[PDB]
């Protein structure tokens, strides 16, 4: 069985393509073309979180919608207070090549990593008064691109070794390793129930994983190039992707195919960040042309543009209550938009 | 209008700002270098002369603190992390002169020097290094001397006139590596020939980064 397995592979791919074609009875803008396209919202800046001295590469909100962490290529990791623009902590990183950061749901730990191939977890609520690193997770052979806290004691990391992984923080070990990607994995998103997570990779494909069994459940194609950002719809039944081809897309798990493509002729710069709203109506997508296009999910209308930043927007995030949006760019500035 | 705990939070924030700007001022005074090469080249010799991801190297020479970001352990795609080095003072690129006739084993029969040339073309014309100078090291020149006689350069460069002198084939290699620069008047490439020794490569990088610093200061002042 040298090429018989390969031939079975193409026949199965064709069968999956036919099954996916069978599901699409009509396009999205044929059953959603009856509701009003609410938008035309500009969300002027309310806070400007200055203090960084290099490109901001990743930010993450807290579950209180009050504290947010930001990572920049200067060996700094700042917990802000978006309400009063205060700084709670300033962690000096051992490796300055940070391009992912996380905030634990309990608010006790902050994750960090990048081109050091190590995910570093910091304790914010020590009795000594200083923020110290708890454990340095090291099992990856490529750059870490995203880390999201499963719980207080579990993390999920995506690396540029065509591999995502799940760790036990206390033991600092590979609880389960998620393999199956062809190119580098660039983004993660954990479902609200914390049982599945999507991972978009440089192979122009995104897959759905089961955290417990440790195997892929669904695979998604459609993009022409690298997938940079990914995020879940609030229900956890859909997820949005963003590629370095100036195109966003929305996949739904049950249908197991794309539904809507967010693109325009005047946008040729790709995407670096994608986030959803509280109701998931707003697809806030940070594009490479120094602005964050506030898309509408149910339609493809570019509802708004957040044109504050004078350099490429690398990270944006929405509060748990949807009150604020915090975009971060290569200009060392964070802006809170409301 | 705000409470005493808010006042003390503001004071703590101001202290954090002062520490942050002090750290930034310290960082902006320290020169950054990116090392690239074909692995078989003298990257290891260069790093060992100065003293599973980025092996970042620190050394101090004539009151300039140096950082050398030795990537190369990354088997991933350079396109997805090369922009993080946008802003290095200079790029150190090492190519082995003893590669034109050394085993054509890049993928399976590809000449090593051709691989180094396409790597140099990729780095030089990259859009993140439009104004980033390149310090090209043409290493293993001794093996070049005792291998020109055994084998001609026509195997790698058939267009060569056949002049198999030491200081004509090396000059030809240097010329072919310069010619890949598609945008002059915005970038200078500093090639280097002293010896297989110390005390000169470090000084060469020091001179190149001093020239880059002067150019950066002129551009900051607006004259150039």
């Amino acid at each position, epitope marked *: 069985e040298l090429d018989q397995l390969r031939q079975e592979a193409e026949q199965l791919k064709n069968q999956i393509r036919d099954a996916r074609k069978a599901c699409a009875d009509a396009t999205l803008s044929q059953i959603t073309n009856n509701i009003d396209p609410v938008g035309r919202i500009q969300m002027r800046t309310r806070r400007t979180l200055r203090g960084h001295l290099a490109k901001i590469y990743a930010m993450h909100w807290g579950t209180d919608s009050r*504290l947010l962490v930001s990572a920049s290529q200067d060996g700094k990791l700042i917990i802000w207070d978006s309400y009063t623009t*205060n700084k709670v902590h300033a962690i000096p990183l051992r490796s300055s090549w940070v391009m992912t950061c996380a905030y634990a749901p309990s608010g006790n730990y902050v994750a960090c990593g990048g081109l050091d191939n190590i995910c570093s977890i910091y304790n914010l609520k020590t009795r*000594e008064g*200083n923020v110290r690193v708890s454990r340095e997770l090291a099992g990856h052979t490529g750059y870490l691109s995203c880390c999201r806290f499963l719980d207080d004691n579990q993390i999920v990391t995506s690396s540029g070794d065509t591999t995502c992984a799940l760790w036990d923080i206390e033991t600092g070990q590979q609880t389960t390793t998620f393999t199956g990607h062809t190119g580098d994995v660039m983004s993660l998103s954990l479902a609200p129930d914390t049982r599945l997570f999507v991972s978009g990779a440089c192979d122009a494909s995104a897959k759905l994983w089961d955290v417990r069994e440790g195997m892929c459940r669904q695979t998604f194609t459609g993009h022409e190039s690298d997938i940079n950002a990914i995020c879940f719809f609030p229900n956890g039944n859909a997820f949005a992707t963003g590629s370095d081809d100036a195109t966003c897309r929305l996949f739904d798990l049950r249908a197991d195919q794309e539904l809507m493509t967010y693109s325009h002729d005047n946008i040729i710069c790709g995407i670096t960040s994608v986030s959803f709203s509280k109701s998931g109506r707003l697809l806030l997508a940070g594009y490479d042309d120094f602005n964050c296009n506030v898309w509408d999910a149910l339609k493809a209308d570019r509802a708004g543009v957040l044109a504050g930043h004078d350099n490429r927007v690398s990270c944006l995030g929405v509060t748990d209550d949807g009150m604020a949006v915090a975009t971060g760019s290569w200009d060392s500035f964070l802006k809170i938009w409301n | 209008t705000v409470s005493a*705990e808010d*006042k*003390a939070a503001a*004071e703590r924030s101001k202290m954090i700002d002062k520490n942050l700007r002090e750290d930034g001022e310290k960082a902006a005074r320290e020169v950054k270098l990116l090392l690239l090469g074909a692995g078989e080249s003298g990257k290891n010799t260069i790093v060992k002369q100065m003293k599973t991801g980025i092996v970042e190297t620190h050394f101090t020479f004539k009151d300039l603190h140096f950082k050398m970001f030795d990537v190369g352990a990354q088997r991933s795609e350079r396109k997805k992390w090369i922009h993080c080095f946008e802003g290095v003072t200079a790029i150190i690129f090492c190519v082995a002169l003893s590669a034109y006739d050394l085993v054509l084993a890049e993928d399976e029969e590809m000449n090593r020097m051709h691989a180094s040339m396409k790597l140099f073309d990729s780095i030089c014309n990259n859009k993140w290094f439009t104004d980033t100078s390149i310090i090209l090291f043409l290493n293993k020149k001794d093996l070049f001397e005792e291998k020109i006689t055994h084998s001609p350069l026509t195997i790698c460069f058939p267009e060569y006139t056949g002049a198999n002198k030491y200081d004509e084939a090396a000059s030809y290699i240097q010329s072919k590596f310069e010619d890949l620069n598609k945008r002059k008047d915005t970038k200078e490439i500093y090639t280097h020939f002293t010896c297989s020794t110390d005390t000169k490569n470090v000084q060469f990088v020091f001179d190149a980064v001093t020239d880059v610093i002067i150019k950066n200061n002129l551009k900051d002042c607006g004259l150039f």
Partner: single-chain antibody
Amino acid sequence: VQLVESGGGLVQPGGSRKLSCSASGFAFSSFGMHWVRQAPEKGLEWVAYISSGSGTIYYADTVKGRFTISRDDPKNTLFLQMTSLRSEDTAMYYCVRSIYYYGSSPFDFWGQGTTLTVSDIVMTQATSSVPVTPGESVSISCRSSKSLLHSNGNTYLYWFLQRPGQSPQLLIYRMSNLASGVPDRFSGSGSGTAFTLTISRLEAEDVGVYYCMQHLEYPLTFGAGTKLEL
């Protein structure tokens, strides 16, 4: 974490002494420091305050012009130089650390104590003592003069317990927020002016004197002190 403090003793009237507090366990360089004294029979009263990166120093009106507070972070020591010691300065002085970042727990750790023998929102704890029995729910009430609530949602009232031969320890930093090593059988509930503490079950360590301290601005007046007895 420990804050051991030395100095103090038989000082002649109209004299001067310096109290020294040494910090070892924690990062003293990033914490504010409060000095809180307590007369041998009377309750607690705030006597000084210094902040991290000393720019804000606050004194009580009782000892404002003749006391001073000094800290030297490299040796992690807190100092208090007092001058013209009037007789009303006989008290047991405590060192308490604090930090004021968002969601911090100020007045969390207290010191051992130093004896001294020399020869504003009003906090009222009307009930001086209560006969309490094992395994019953008890509640302590504290009354204020000005509203302790602030426009930012906070309510600056602090609850402490002073065991018979022990230093005070924080139970409730805000009006409703517990502390690190405190059992979850303590609870706090207040209003604009009225404030109450609740204990679900009395234990063998809960006997002591309970105090309430305001932190609206900086007078930091403590209350009279409710003393549970079994």
